[PDB]
Amino acid sequence: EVQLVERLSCAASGFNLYSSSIHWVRQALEWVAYIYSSSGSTSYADSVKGRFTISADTSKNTAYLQVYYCARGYYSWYKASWALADYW
Amino acid sequence: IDEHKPSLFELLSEQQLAALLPPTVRYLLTVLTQRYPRYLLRVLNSFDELYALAALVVERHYLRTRGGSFTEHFYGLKRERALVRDALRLRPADVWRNLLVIVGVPYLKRKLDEAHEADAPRAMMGAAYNRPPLPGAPWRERVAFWWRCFLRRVYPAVNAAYYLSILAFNLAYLFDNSKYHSPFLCLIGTRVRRMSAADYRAIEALEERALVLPTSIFALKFLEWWYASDFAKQLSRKAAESLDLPPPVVAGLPEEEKERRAIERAPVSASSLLPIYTVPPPENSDQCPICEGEITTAAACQTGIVYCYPCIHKWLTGTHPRQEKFMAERAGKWESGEGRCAVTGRRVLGGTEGLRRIMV
Amino acid sequence: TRPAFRVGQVDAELLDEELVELLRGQVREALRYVGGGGSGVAQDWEAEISLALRAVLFKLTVWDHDATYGAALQNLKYTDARRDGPALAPPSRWQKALYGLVTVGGRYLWAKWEDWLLEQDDPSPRVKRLARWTSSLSTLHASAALVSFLVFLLHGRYRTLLDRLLRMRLAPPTSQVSFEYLNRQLVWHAFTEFLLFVLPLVGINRWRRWLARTWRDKKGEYSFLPERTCAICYRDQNSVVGSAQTDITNPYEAIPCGCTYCFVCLATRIEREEGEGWPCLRCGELIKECKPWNGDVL
Amino acid sequence: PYAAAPDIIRAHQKDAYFQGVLANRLSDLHRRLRGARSAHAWAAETRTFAAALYLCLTTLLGNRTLGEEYCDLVQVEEGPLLPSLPRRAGYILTAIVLPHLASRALPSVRSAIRKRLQSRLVLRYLLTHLTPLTSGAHFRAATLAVFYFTGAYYELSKWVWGLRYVFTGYEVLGVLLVVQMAVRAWLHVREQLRTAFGPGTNVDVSLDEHAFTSNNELLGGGSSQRSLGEIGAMAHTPVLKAGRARYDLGTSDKVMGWIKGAQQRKCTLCLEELKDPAATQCGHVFCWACIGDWVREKPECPLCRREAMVQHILPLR
Amino acid sequence: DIQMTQSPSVTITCRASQSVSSAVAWYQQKPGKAPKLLIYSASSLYSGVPSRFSGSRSGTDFTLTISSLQPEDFATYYCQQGSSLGLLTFGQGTKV
Ligand SMILES: CC(C)CCC[C@@H](C)[C@H]1CC[C@H]2[C@@H]3CC=C4C[C@@H](O)CC[C@]4(C)[C@H]3CC[C@]12C
Ligand SMILES: CC(C)CCC[C@@H](C)[C@H]1CC[C@H]2[C@@H]3CC=C4C[C@@H](O)CC[C@]4(C)[C@H]3CC[C@]12C
Ligand SMILES: CC(C)CCC[C@@H](C)[C@H]1CC[C@H]2[C@@H]3CC=C4C[C@@H](O)CC[C@]4(C)[C@H]3CC[C@]12C
Ligand SMILES: CC(C)CCC[C@@H](C)[C@H]1CC[C@H]2[C@@H]3CC=C4C[C@@H](O)CC[C@]4(C)[C@H]3CC[C@]12C
Ligand SMILES: [Zn+2]
Ligand SMILES: [Zn+2]
Ligand SMILES: [Zn+2]
Ligand SMILES: [Zn+2]
Ligand SMILES: [Zn+2]
């Protein structure tokens, strides 16, 4: 079962973040940032740009950002679009 | 000996023209929509099917009267029933099969090519994008996923098989081993022949019995000439011709007391406010500034200076003995020439890969 | 005043080369989507594809009917020059076998050998000696082919040197407008030449821009390129990893941007736009001047 | 005289193709036996020799050139009367050898007239346009226009020796050529109302009617800058005065010492002293201006025929 | 940037500043619970979600429709739009 249990550490279980997109979204909903492990591509929002540095290590399947939710990006096939499956 | 057998060159040229027509019509339609994005935008969005229908009508009319397709007639070719004029003429069912091959197969091939080429970038984007839909997703999602899987895995093989079967039938046709130059002509039992004098006479008589035919055949000639003369490329080269420029330039070119002077002469790096080690200009031109000896294997860096190839290679890699001796007591407090031009000290974009081996 | 006896053979060879090229193009289209989704597979195996096509053609055309497609289009056929008389003897099996070996096999093996010699260059004394020997062999063959062509201009019997050595000769087995069309192509050629001469004078880039305007600084989309690559070169070639074709030579930096291109590329664009600034391709800003790259120093 | 202009044009095009292919073979042999520098040194001589060989194995012997064979033409003298050996030899001498000798001798005559005008006693117009006026391209264009109209003598030398073509609305070409020449003259007249280098070792020829190579060429073979000073001002490049060049190897043997030997200190294009040396991507050094003009014409190194992009030429320092 | 505005704060409506094609999804946030995906595309119902939720589009106006509101359906419904890359922007959320 795909579990995504949350320097904030997010540990992914049931899947390998090497082959997914990890999106951090905070709530006071505002999308904080996303990371592609395979290519290392990372992007942020204007508010958190610079002050927040995100990355991830595949060896322990963890993502670091330095309530906050982690979700798994899912790119649809019909009218391809980005959704967030498996919040937290 | 068998006149009325078109050479494979004629058939291949005719097929090239038939393949050139749809992109040309699409480009013209796109331009006209750019002018008026009101009535033609809907047509452009559904171009493929409307071009298929127009081609159906035109090719059907040409098959019934001229005996061959529009471009085939333009080339003096006709389609006969492989097995007297009545016996070899195309019956209505044969006309419909010829329409299916002439219009249906190219239409479907264009649709599949377009779908595959639109999907390819997502296919190569990565594995984050290409996550299969879990079961229970709406039938549309699963159908789209399976369509993409087909386009990515099966379609390349189908395209290869299509073109390789065409190639096999061309090779067989060369020397009367096949009688058909294409597998789909073989399936429908039709063969392209060269129109004779009698066929031309019949066509002319039928025309006489009854301003677009001349205008449509001078458009085909113009399209053929446009693509054979490579006119677009020549005009682009003439327009995008080289500009007469002056030669470039580089910015750099026109006992503790020693250390202060050494820092004074050295150019200070930009990323770090730190001096750069640079060798003095040689006393005489015929000398490598790095090793201060005769230039053996001349090579030029990105700045245009010419050194010995091994000398400058090592200097760029930051392993030349001259650097290490100077870097023994100045670690941190100085910047070696690693990735820099030895003389000017300017950084070099290509590193070592971008060195010119000058053939003196 | 003698009947044509050389142009047929020249046309035969030209048609054979054209045919091999066309079939190779069909194989390229077949391998168009294979290998992912550039040259790719078809360019990697160009020699092997050509060898396979030439072998199939030799079996289907020369071996079976004693005439290359192109020799058959001209009503020619290979004959044994050794056996004289109007009988018009066919070539022997050994003649065809050697013709194939040299034309389909020998060409491929020589191409592979020359490619390998080029690879070994970076070289060993043995590599240098072998390169010298093969350059000598190729020069000897080039001289022989030139002299055989000069003799063919006189007598018109053997078109190639291999044909002369094997004694296989192209002869017409049997008797068995086309000029008006070409004379019309002459007028088409003249008119297109006139257009190519005239359009650059009036200025076709400027008029094309005006016609586009009449008919119809956010970050640019080439920022992903490494600093090695020139954005102008990349755009104009691939209309990533830095290659030899797109690297920046003579790096000049745009005055306001700081982005680096080749001196020629940047200067040519800034001059094409005249006073109006050329929009940068890396950050989208507008550029009206450039300076030699500071090279990461003050 | 019973031959139409288009047939003569096509026959000449095919003859030019075969002469060019022979010249290409000879230049390739020259480059195999000796370096590419010597092959490029004798490119024009090799082309003339290839044309002379082609016309010495076909015409000089009374046979028909391959171009004539294609178009079903017979070269008669005014078939009813084939030309004699003296006529054919004279035509070959006048059509191939004489133009090459005149081309070789023209620079000296141009320099002599240039000095004489420089000593003064409309003349300044002649001085600034002496090279265009004394070149044979425009005389050849005039010959071609007269041929397209009359349809008699493709080359000036076939009229001298009275050689016509016999078998076994194309004045449009002449109209276009006349218009082109008139426009070319007008552009120069309107102003007051570079170097050719010739081709290199290899010249592109083709037998296709739609090739647009040198041989398939009906009309004449033969502003947007800012004076090379304004471009330097825009690019912050200090541009030296015209003629004066940074790093000219003719000033002294110590300008760039690592280039040793008088063979290696002269560019193969302008044959003068290397000034503003610039290395193509392949590594061969020419003057900046010379290789700039060459790659403007043909995007290719004049020596090794490798691809050369005008943007990737590196001046040396 | 793209602004995603939900008029309410049942047929919940939302609008986008520009033309975002059909890339709009809906999430359900329960009090002190993680959001649950409902419709990842404009109308593609996420697996396991009851059929009562439906998504619809009209130009640049998206709508989430619940035919028969259930007692456990109370939550905040969030609209999200993503670009071609993974750049997302959420809405304001609508309480039912
Ligand atoms: C007789 C028909 C076919 C052609 C008529 C126009 C011909 C002669 C062309 C050839 C070169 C042309 C000139 C090229 C250069 C310029 C500058 C530009 O700002 C347009 C005007 C002007 C001055 C053009 C006028 C028209 C021109 C003279
Ligand atoms: C019939 C076709 C093949 C001939 C080509 C059309 C030529 C003649 C057209 C195309 C552009 C035209 C010119 C466009 C603008 C100008 C500026 C004006 O001050 C003089 C005429 C001039 C220079 C046009 C003259 C002709 C002209 C050159
Ligand atoms: C296949 C080639 C070699 C046939 C030779 C005959 C033709 C091409 C002529 C034209 C110009 C001639 C050369 C003119 C000058 C020289 C310099 C010297 O080095 C002697 C030969 C050399 C280099 C000529 C050799 C031949 C030669 C190249
Ligand atoms: C049938 C023959 C005459 C055809 C032409 C032969 C060619 C190879 C001859 C004609 C004129 C000859 C040259 C005449 C004079 C010179 C002087 C010197 O610069 C080197 C050779 C050079 C330049 C001749 C080289 C060859 C050469 C070009
Ligand atoms: Zn050195
Ligand atoms: Zn910029
Ligand atoms: Zn560039
Ligand atoms: Zn020069
Ligand atoms: Zn070179």
Residue numbers in the entry:
A (entry chain H): 4 to 9, 22 to 43, 48 to 85, 96 to 117
B (entry chain B): 56 to 138, 153 to 279, 298 to 341, 379 to 484
C (entry chain A): 6 to 42, 55 to 139, 144 to 197, 202 to 241, 257 to 279, 294 to 352
D (entry chain C): 20 to 97, 127 to 169, 201 to 247, 276 to 300, 323 to 351, 358 to 452
E (entry chain L): 2 to 10, 20 to 106
What does the original paper state about this entry?
Recycling requires receptor modification by a membrane-embedded ubiquitin ligase complex comprising three RING finger domain-containing proteins (Pex2, Pex10 and Pex12). Here we report a cryo-electron microscopy structure of the ligase complex, which together with biochemical and in vivo experiments reveals its function as a retrotranslocation channel for peroxisomal import receptors. We propose that the N terminus of a recycling receptor is inserted from the peroxisomal lumen into the pore and monoubiquitylated by RF2 to enable extraction into the cytosol.
A cryo-EM structure of the Pex2–Pex10–Pex12–Fab complex in digitonin was determined at 3.1 Å overall resolution. The density map allowed model building for all parts of the proteins, with the exception of some loops that were invisible and not conserved in other species. The Fab bound to a cavity formed by a cytosolic loop of Pex12. The three Pex proteins form a channel with their transmembrane segments and a cytosolic tower with their ring finger domains. Each protein has five transmembrane segments, most of which were missed in predictions because of their hydrophilicity. The transmembrane segments of the Pex proteins form a channel with an open pore. Because this segment comprises only five small amino acids, it is unlikely to occlude the pore, leaving an opening of approximately 10 Å in diameter. RF2 sits right above the pore, suggesting that a recycling receptor inserts its N-terminal segment into the pore, so that RF2 can catalyse monoubiquitylation at its conserved Cys. In our cryo-EM structure, the predicted interactions of RF2 and RF10 with E2 enzymes would lead to steric clashes, indicating that both ring fingers need to undergo a conformational change to become active.
